[PDB]
Design a binder for this molecule. Structure first.
Ligand SMILES: C[C@H](CCC(=O)NCCC[N+](C)(C)C[C@H](O)CS(=O)(=O)O)[C@H]1CC[C@H]2[C@@H]3[C@H](O)C[C@@H]4C[C@H](O)CC[C@]4(C)[C@H]3C[C@H](O)[C@]12C
Ligand SMILES: C[C@H](CCC(=O)NCCC[N+](C)(C)C[C@H](O)CS(=O)(=O)O)[C@H]1CC[C@H]2[C@@H]3[C@H](O)C[C@@H]4C[C@H](O)CC[C@]4(C)[C@H]3C[C@H](O)[C@]12C
Ligand SMILES: [Mg+2]
Ligand SMILES: [Zn+2]
Ligand SMILES: [Zn+2]
Ligand SMILES: [Zn+2]
Lengths: 72, 72, 102, 49, 247, 1344
DNA sequence: CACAAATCCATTGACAAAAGAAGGCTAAAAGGGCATATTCCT
């Protein structure tokens, strides 16, 4: 009907997919590596506790974030 | 006149129904006959569909009446 | 304007068109005058169609009607005067009285 | 605009999708009248006749 | 007076109308209290006392109005202009909370929930589950119908293509666009469509005959050629192209 | 009366035949009088008189002079309309080139003379000569020269050159060349050069030349020497009030071309220098070229207006042009507009009308009646008196409107239900009434929306409107049989408030003698509207043959439900009004009423349900109050906890444990979890907060909060928005998709400070901006669907074929996403339906599966129903009625005539609006429930564990129930660890397969030892020893891992025995040695033992839903990652290596495998080079293209892929749409086709032509003794399938007009009016609907 | 039967008029020319 009555649907679809993507981008479960893969060096157990499923230490993950930031 | 399901009870395809009600209403409006069913002060289309709704008119009865007119 | 893309020419109307009512009027006129011209004498009914441009390629002048009806250039106007003087009757030719609006 | 005693309730379908049901007291108190002073011009262009 | 639809508020999430109509109910209640005090010509002192206590409530509200430099000379006027209802303010984002609205509703003796029992006029019997009232500030937008409603039997016709005009100023007819032609094709309407795009719009000789047969009680229709198609013939043929209508 | 519209090139003698004279002067009119000039662009003599029956000099001014042309002014006195009909011509001083054969895309004069278009351009604009009769010196007809070369050819001989430059040169080129000579020449020069490019190119060009041949058209006709002018009227020079004038740009364009022509004439009689005259000729070619069209030429040569002058062709094409806008979309007389309001009082079969509009539209009717009554004299008196509006005209109007319907219509007519006919009801005021149960069908609220009313004039029109279009006949949607008169927004709230148990109220728990005493007890004020009650009722559960057998009971129910029962008709059972009766249930109620009791009772019951629902929602006093928006008491707790969480993550981020690009995601997920928690808390505190105490103790009931009551009822809104009221309101993502990490912790019952509102504004703005843009293309996919399948109508009654699709539910291992009920309701079975008892013929050959047969199958559980689709209907030029089925607005079998193409388009379109406008995006088979298991394509062996494991590829699991069906299926990949077998009645909750993405094994078929072949280190592979524990193994190495000294070898761990052979795989002529590709992770070293089915070497390794995903999906566009498959069915094997891409061929069982192409290893292989994969088997990667589904798995798969592809876009949206329609667009997508061999045909073998010519041809040639011919099935996207059309008027109306016209011009095409887009143009009846009789009988007239 | 007027269509015979093609008037358009040297813009 009225365009605000529709535009709410557009907005909520946009934001629902936003939350879904940014909530699916966290790794759920698995056997932690105990070592950042890019360096084979230990990922300290605090990081192992917060996100169960991490596979990088802070440095190599930071590098990958910066690399993906330019999208290619 | 409310609904024409009965007109599908009489003939089929729902199109020859309309196009023959139009011919019978030609006969009944452009003075060539009067109705076989008592019109309760109704419009010509109404009467045509009604007398169709009695099994009194369809393509065959109208055409045989046509031939009887050809006897003149 | 309107951002509708209507050009200027999309609003310039016609002036050659016969007003669809005025055609509907005139179809009764040649019928209605046919009505009184029905209840005329064969001379008056024919002479008036003779005198005026009715139902043909027509408007034969008064001398021309004097020839065809074979009476007189002067006598025709007499029966022509006789024609509508009988038609000038209120309560006889009131049909065209309908085609008057002051 | 002007403030009306307004109630929120269906009342018999006269406000179905976005409708409204104004009392005759509103239109009789002259409470929503307006003045539309519209204009009409007319020229005299001397034509060829 | 006005009976809105209570379903508008969930979907259209605009709580402003409920909250504002509650607050306006409080304002008109204060006004009705003042009018009872006034038309009865209660006092000047008691009127002053009540108005004063009405003009202050709510924590640290920025304005400070009092009746020292008044009055009387002023509170009779400041009543007679508030007799229709104490006009309130509310800043755009620093407005009154729900609480101060309810305190207004308690000042005048309206129900704090903002909701009354109403009685159906026709039946005279009483609704269930009290309904909300209050003084919403309505407006009259200028989509006024009687410059909107419009229709034509047979008006004028555009020059180049023999079709009706477009505007209600010029008596344009309703556009029979492209989607409507599909809509009629989807049904069996074919004579409907034929008249709609031949004798009602475009055809020069069929439209006159159509009008005549209407006045003569014969509801027939003589097709003829759509004038727009004749223009398109002259236009396609205006190039070195020979389009023709075969036998 | 005409037929078979024609078109072709125009001869100069033709064009002279049209005109009535030739324009010479560039004058137009007289500037003092406004009479036309002598022979200007408005002539008296040429284009006739100016006013009715008079000359222009005034010598003759009567109708009696009709026809005779005056002698002084010479203007043929006739009607003044004749100026609209005459045409003028122009004799150009020199030749000039038509732009449409010049600069159009395929260059009609380009490939008519072997030339590049730039060559003929250099010729035309007087740049370089072109040789004709160029002697036997250097050239004969083609090659260009220069002025150095022109003079060194004119050097040494003046004779023997005979060439010109420009228009005359091209004209002598065309006028000299013969068609038959060149066609036969390149015919002989074709089959000796039918190389793959040369063959098709020369064949198409010779096709064009032969089309020129049989046309009788002459190429030199293409170049213009006489130019025809429009009549004056179509390019008028109207007088504007105030002395000004208005003309069309055609006028000044004609004027400029006449000026350049006069100038070139003056030049020619001067014999001025050839430079100036050549510039004149160039300029005239420019002028004419910009006359016929404005685009191909560089600069649209504008005027004093700073806009481009609008030339000829622009008045045919484009949106604005005659075709697309004015020739279909045109205004109408007897039609009016107004604002719509509700007026719920009046029945569905009618609408209120303003009295003024009613007296306007039916003006001529009322004139006719006032003359029939004699209440007036003539029509003039009638108009005068109706303008006075005396009393009698009101009764005349009430009389004439009485049974006379009117059409209502809205601006956005999406589907056919956007136009319905009502019976008027004379209303004062100026709004238009409307039955509220029809708004939803229109999709119009009452915020000031405006319908329009047209009057059906013709008596056939009145009957069409009443019998086909009237609202009461049109209640069921066409896109799906769901009734679309459902209670929309407020009557559902009243009905839900009516049927609602409360534990204690007035008169709780009595007994009532009937529903009527319930009503009498409630209105008197002795029981509540909804108090739990034992009631005596009587339900008419008709069970026998139309027998309405009543039977009573003592139902325990609400007083309200008992009341509502009194409006239910005889049919239904009481268990339908014996619930809460929300929005869903009541729609189901109307659906069941239609299903059980016909139509008329359902319409009467619909009006009753609306009346009673409105009345009780009035009684309810259902309000919304600020107290009714409850805030959970435990909200601030959750807020504090989540703020503690965000502080915690911030603390850790300062501790150097996380990235900001993950701190973001953690805080987002924190707030989202808090949001769902707040919503659940608020629902608990609101959905059932109501506690009540009958007989002491308190009890729990659903709440009576009248926001909950308007969400649980489903009237308006849902639980989510009510969250948005009380709880916290989301996170409010930015416009693009970046979510802003600090939520709006407020709600709407509390306020929002400026930054909360500002953060809201991003999403609100984007949403409103893109909902105002689905308006910009409300009808774009609808248009591009209609303009492809419009020409398709049900034409015959039954084509007697047996093909179709085997319907089966859409289940993917979860729950049945689409039962066999819906996918088969209303279709026609092509064969019997055999119960799994294998002798129970249930529906023989042509039983239309209504609710009853589909019911019987439902409780019989047969799920194998071969149903005749439309797409395999054998009919020609249409579809078998019995093939299409029944899904009409009317429940019965389709009837011949119905334009099912258009309704298919409008059904696949209009819910498209209900979709999202923007393309959004989104391991072991554990048995989920009880049953048995079936492995389809189960080609496996007892493996190393003695168990089952996938040696095949397409093993698809199935939760076998004992019903005779497939309960829940799964896919089992290659080498899956089948923890059981096939045919085991198993338990629930069990993983019967397992496999690893990093272990795609090459497990052994049978036993053997670890005895290698070719596995050589340094030459082929690396002697890997993973010495973290010390294990050595010979893993296979790819060619960039293998050296060149072993790259021409094929590594494999050869299957052996304890003896010394290579044990050959039984079934093939090869010994078993499992050749391995790169990365083939091997462990078993040389000489180790294995047995049958052991782990040899286990090599390692989102759905969209938008609308423009669908238009693409209806286009067969080759996606980014196509998946090619096998063209042959047999054992495969590799080939050449890395010519950019790997090579490998699929070897037949006995035939030849010449099939190989550039297989890139970037796209990973899923099959080795030793499997017997059949045609249509998965080798490539990614998303399969729909084309290859057709060419490999046939037409039925490509349609079952496409309907099951586009349906799930609707499915993923919650939208419902029938599948029948998505086939009818399919059937247009594959109408073209290509040939396999000529045989007895008349076309090229490697050619393309539509199906039906072949379909009529080689089925007829079987009737003859001659051979049939074979054909390849093409497949075109809708916009690409739509251009290919048999007409040339149906194509000009929608596609590139100039492209269609020149092609259909040079082709000499002849259109015989068929389809629905052309007959609208010509304005005769349509072939499809009511005018199906009118068009067949033309065939009898076209049959003598 | 059978004689005397009112007046029918028949001219007859005068006049007042309307236009219809030429004759006089004249304003309009059309054409016919003017050399110290201006040398590629849009
Ligand atoms: C709000 C909107 C109402 C319009 C009718 C509803 C209707 C169906 C909803 C989508 C589907 O659920 C599938 C999917 C589920 C994921 O979880 C979130 C994404 C998806 C795409 C949803 C977004 C949104 O919520 C939709 C568009
Ligand atoms: C309605 C529309 C404006 C709405 C925005 C206005 C804008 C210009 C107007 C026309 C032009 O003036 C030309 C012409 C002048 C005549 O003398 C009267 C008629 C014409 C057609 C006008 C009618 C109308 O009024 C027009 C379409
Ligand atoms: Mg709207
Ligand atoms: Zn690292
Ligand atoms: Zn003349
Ligand atoms: Zn079929």
């Amino acid at each position: 009907s009225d365009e605000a009555d529709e535009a709410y649907s557009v907005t909520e679809q946009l934001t629902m997919t936003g939350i879904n993507r940014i909530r699916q981008k966290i790794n759920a479960h698995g056997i932690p590596v105990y070592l950042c893969e890019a360096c084979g060096n230990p990922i300290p157990e605090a990081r192992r506790k917060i996100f169960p499923g991490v596979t990088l230490c802070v440095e190599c993950q930071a590098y990958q974030e910066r690399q993906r930031k330019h999208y290619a | 006149r409310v609904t024409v399901q009965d007109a599908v009870e009489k003939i089929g395809n729902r199109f020859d129904l309309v196009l023959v009600a139009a011919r019978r209403a030609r006969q009944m409006q452009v003075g060539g006959k009067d109705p076989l069913v008592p019109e309760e002060n109704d419009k010509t289309t109404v009467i045509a569909l009604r007398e169709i709704e009695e099994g009194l008119i369809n393509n065959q009865i109208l055409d045989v009446r046509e031939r009887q007119e050809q006897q003149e | 304007g309107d951002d509708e893309d209507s050009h200027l020419g999309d609003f310039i109307e016609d002036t050659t068109l016969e007003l669809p009512l005025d055609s509907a009027t005139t179809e009764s006129l040649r019928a209605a005058t046919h009505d009184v011209l029905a209840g005329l004498t064969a001379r008056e009914a024919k002479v008036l169609r003779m005198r005026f441009g009715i139902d043909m390629n027509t408007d034969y002048t008064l001398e021309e009607v004097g020839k065809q009806f074979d009476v007189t250039r002067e006598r025709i106007r007499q029966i022509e005067a006789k024609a509508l003087r009988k038609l000038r009757h209120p309560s006889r030719s009131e049909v065209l009285r309908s085609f008057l609006d002051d | 605009g002007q403030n009306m005693r307004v109630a929120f309730m269906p009342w018999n379908g006269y406000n179905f999708e976005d409708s409204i049901l104004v009392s005759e007291r509103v239109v009789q108190e002259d409470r929503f009248t307006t003045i539309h002073i519209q204009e009409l011009a007319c020229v005299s262009r001397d034509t060829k006749l | 007076d006005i009976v809105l639809n209570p379903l508008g508020v969930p979907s259209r999430m605009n709580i402003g109308q409920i909250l504002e109509t509650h607050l306006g109910m409080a304002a008109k209640g204060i006004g009705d209290k003042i009018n009872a005090m006034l038309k009865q010509q209660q006092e000047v002192a008691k009127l002053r006392e009540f108005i004063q206590r009405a003009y202050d409530l709510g924590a640290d509200v920025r304005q400070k109005v009092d009746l020292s430099t008044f009055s009387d000379e002023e509170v009779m006027r400041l009543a007679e202009n508030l007799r229709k209802g104490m006009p309130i303010a509310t800043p755009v984002f620093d407005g009154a909370k729900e609480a101060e609205i309810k305190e207004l509703l308690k000042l005048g003796d309206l129900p704090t929930s903002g909701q009354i029992r109403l009685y159906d006029g026709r039946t005279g019997e009483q609704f269930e589950r009290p309904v909300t009232v209050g003084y919403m500030y309505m407006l009259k937008l200028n989509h006024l119908v009687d410059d909107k409603m419009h229709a034509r039997s047979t008006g004028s016709y555009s020059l180049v293509t023999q079709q009706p005009l477009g505007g209600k100023a010029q008596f344009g007819g309703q556009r029979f666009g492209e989607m409507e032609v599909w809509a009629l094709e989807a049904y069996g309407a074919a004579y409907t469509l034929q008249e709609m795009l031949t004798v009602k719009s475009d055809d020069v000789n069929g439209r006159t005959k159509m009008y005549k047969n209407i006045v003569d009680g014969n509801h027939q229709m003589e097709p003829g050629m759509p004038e727009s198609f004749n223009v398109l013939l002259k236009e396609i043929r205006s190039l070195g192209i020979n389009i023709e209508l075969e036998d | 009366e005409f037929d078979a519209i024609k078109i072709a090139l125009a001869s100069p003698d033709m064009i002279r035949s049209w005109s009535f004279g030739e324009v010479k002067k560039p004058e137009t009119i007289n500037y003092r009088t406004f009479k036309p000039e002598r022979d200007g662009l408005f002539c008296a003599r040429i284009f006739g008189p100016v006013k009715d029956y008079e000359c222009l000099c005034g010598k003759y001014k009567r109708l009696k002079h009709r026809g005779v042309i005056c002698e002084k002014c010479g203007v043929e006195v006739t009607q003044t309309k004749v100026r609209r009909e005459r045409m003028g011509h122009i004799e150009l001083a020199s030749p000039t080139a038509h732009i449409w054969f010049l600069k159009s895309l395929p260059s009609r004069i380009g490939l008519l003379l072997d030339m590049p278009l730039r060559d003929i351009e250099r010729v035309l604009y007087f740049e370089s000569y072109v040789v004709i009769e160029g002697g036997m010196t250097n050239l004969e007809r083609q090659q260009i020269l220069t002025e150095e070369q022109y003079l060194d050819a004119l050097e040494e001989f003046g004779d023997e050159f005979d060439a010109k430059m420009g228009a005359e040169a091209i004209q002598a080129l065309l006028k000299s060349m013969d068609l038959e000579q060149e066609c036969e020449q390149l015919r002989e020069e074709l089959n000796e050069t039918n190389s793959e490019t040369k063959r098709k190119k020369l064949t198409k060009r010779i096709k064009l030349l032969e089309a020129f041949v049989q046309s009788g058209n002459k190429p030199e006709w293409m170049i213009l020497t006489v130019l025809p002018v429009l009549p004056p009227d179509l390019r008028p020079l109207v007088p504007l009030d105030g002395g000004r004038f208005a003309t069309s740009d055609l006028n000044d364009l004609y004027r400029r071309v006449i000026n350049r022509n006069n100038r070139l004439k003056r030049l020619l009689d001067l014999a001025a220098p050839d430079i100036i005259v050549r510039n004149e000729k160039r300029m005239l070619q420019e002028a004419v070229d910009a006359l016929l069209d404005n685009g191909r030429r560089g600069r649209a040569i504008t005027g004093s207006n700073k806009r481009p002058l609008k030339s000829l062709a622009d008045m045919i094409k484009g949106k604005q042009g005659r075709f697309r806008q004015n020739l279909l979309g045109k205004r109408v007389d007897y039609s009016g507009r107004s604002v719509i309001t509700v007026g719920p009082y009046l029945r569905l079969h009618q609408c209120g009308l303003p009295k003024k509009m009613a007296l306007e539209l039916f003006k001529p009717f009322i004139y006719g009646k006032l003359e029939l009554r004699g209440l007036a004299t003539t029509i003039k008196a009638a108009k005068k008196m109706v303008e006075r509006e005396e009393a009698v005209v009101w009764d005349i109007l009430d009389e004439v409107i009485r049974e006379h319907p009117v059409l209502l219509n809205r601006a956005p007519t999406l589907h056919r239900l956007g136009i319905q006919a009502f019976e008027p009801v004379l209303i004062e005021g100026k709004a238009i009434q409307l039955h509220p149960l029809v708004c939803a069908a229109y999709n119009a609220d009452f915020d000031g929306d405006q319908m329009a009313v047209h009057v059906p004039l013709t008596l056939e029109a009145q009957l069409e409107a009443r019998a086909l279009m009237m609202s009461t006949n049109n209640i069921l949607s066409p896109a799906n049989g769901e009734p679309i008169i459902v209670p929309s927004q407020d009557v559902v709230l009243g009905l839900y408030y009516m049927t609602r148990d409360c534990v204690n109220a007035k008169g709780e728990g009595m007994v009532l003698t009937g529903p009527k005493e319930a009503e009498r007890l409630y209105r008197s004020g002795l029981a509540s509207l909804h108090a739990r009650v034992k009631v005596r009722i009587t339900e008419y559960e008709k069970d026998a043959n139309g027998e309405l057998v009543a039977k009573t009971s003592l139902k325990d129910t609400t007083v309200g439900r008992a009341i509502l029962w009194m409006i239910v008709p005889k049919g239904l059972p009481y268990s339908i009004v014996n619930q809460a009766l929300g929005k869903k249930a009541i729609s189901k109620m109307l659906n069941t009423c239609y299903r059980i009791l016909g139509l008329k009772p359902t319409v009467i019951f619909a009006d009753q349900i609306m009346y009673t629902g409105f009345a009780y929602a009035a009684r309810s006093g259902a309000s919304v109050g600020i107290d009714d928006m409850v805030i959970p008491e435990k909200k601030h707790e959750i807020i504090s906890e989540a703020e503690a969480e965000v502080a915690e993550i911030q603390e850790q981020f300062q501790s150097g444990l996380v990235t900001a690009g993950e701190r973001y995601n953690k805080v987002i997920d924190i707030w989202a979890a808090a949001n769902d928690r707040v919503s659940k808390a608020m629902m608990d505190n609101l959905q059932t907060e109501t506690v009540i105490n009958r007989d002491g103790q308190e009890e729990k009931q659903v709440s009576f909060n009248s926001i909950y009551m308007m969400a649980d009822s489903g009237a308006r809104g849902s639980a989510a928005q009510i969250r948005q009221l009380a709880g916290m309101r989301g996170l409010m993502a930015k416009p693009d998709g970046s979510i802003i990490e600090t939520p709006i912790t407020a709600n709407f019952r509390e306020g929002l400070n400026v930054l909360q509102y500002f953060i809201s504004t991003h999403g609100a703005r984007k949403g409103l901006a893109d909902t105002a843009l689905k308006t910009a293309n409300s009808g774009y996919l609808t248009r591009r669907l209609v303009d492809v399948a419009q020409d398709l109508v049900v034409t015959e009654d039954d084509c007697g074929t047996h093909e179709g699709i085997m319907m089966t539910p859409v289940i993917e291992g979860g729950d049945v996403k689409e039962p066999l009920r819906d996918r088969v309701l209303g279709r026609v079975t092509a064969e019997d339906v055999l119960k799994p008892g294998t002798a129970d013929i249930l529906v023989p050959r042509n039983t239309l599966l209504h609710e009853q047969w589909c019911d019987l199958l439902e409780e019989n559980s047969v799920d194998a129903v071969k149903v005749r689709s439309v797409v395999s209907c054998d009919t020609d030029f249409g579809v078998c009625a019995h093939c299409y089925g029944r899904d009409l607005a009317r429940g019965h079998i389709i009837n011949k005539g119905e334009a099912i193409g258009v309704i298919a388009a409008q059904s696949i379109g209009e819910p498209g609006t209900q979709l999202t406008m923007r393309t959004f995006h989104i391991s072991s088979i554990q048995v989920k429930n009880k049953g048995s298991i079936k492995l389809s394509n189960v080609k496996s062996v007892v493996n190393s564990s003695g168990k089952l494991v996938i040696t095949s590829r397409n093993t698809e699991l199935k939760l076998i129930d004992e019903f005779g069906r497939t309960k829940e299926s799964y896919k089992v990949p290659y080498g899956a660890v089948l923890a059981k077998g096939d045919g085991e009645q198993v338990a629930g909750g069990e993983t019967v397969a397992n496999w690893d993405p990093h272990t795609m094994p090459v497990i052994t078929e049978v036993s053997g030892f670890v005895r290698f072949t070719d596995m050589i280190d340094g030459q082929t592979i690396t002697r890997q020893t993973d010495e973290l524990t010390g294990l050595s193994s010979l893993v296979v190495l790819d060619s960039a891992e293998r050296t060149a000294g072993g790259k021409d070898l094929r590594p494999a761990l050869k299957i052996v025995d304890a003896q010394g052979n290579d044990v050959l795989i039984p079934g093939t002529d090869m010994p078993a040695q499992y050749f391995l590709p790169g990365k083939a992770i091997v462990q078993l070293e040389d000489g180790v033992q294995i047995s049958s089915g052991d782990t040899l070497a286990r090599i390692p390794q989102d759905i969209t839903g938008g609308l423009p995903r669908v238009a693409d999906l209806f286009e067969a566009r080759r996606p980014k990652e196509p998946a090619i498959l096998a063209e042959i069915s047999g054992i495969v094997s590799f080939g050449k290596e890395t010519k950019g891409k790997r090579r490998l061929v699929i070897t037949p069982v006995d035939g030849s495998d010449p099939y190989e192409e550039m297989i890139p290893k970037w796209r990973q292989l899923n099959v080795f080079e030793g499997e017997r994969v059949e045609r249509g088997d998965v080798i490539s990667d990614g998303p399969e293209a729909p084309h290859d589904i057709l060419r490999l798995r046939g037409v039925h798969a490509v349609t079952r892929y496409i309907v099951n592809e586009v349906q799930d876009v609707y499915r993923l949206q919650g939208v419902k749409i029938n599948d029948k329609h998505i086939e009818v667009i399919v059937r247009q997508m594959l109408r073209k086709a290509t040939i396999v061999n000529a045989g007895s045909s008349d076309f090229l073998e490697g050619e393309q032509v539509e199906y039906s010519r072949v379909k009529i041809a080689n089925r007829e040639l079987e009737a003859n003794g001659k051979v049939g011919a074979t054909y390849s099935r093409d497949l075109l996207g809708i916009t690409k399938a739509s251009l290919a059309t048999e007409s040339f008027i149906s194509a000009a109306s929608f596609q590139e007009t100039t492209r269609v016209l020149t092609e259909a011009a040079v082709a000499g095409k002849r259109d015989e009016l068929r389809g629905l887009k052309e007959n609208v143009i010509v304005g005769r009846l349509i072939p499809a609907g009511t005018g199906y009789a009118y068009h067949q009988d033309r065939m009898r007239r076209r049959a003598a």
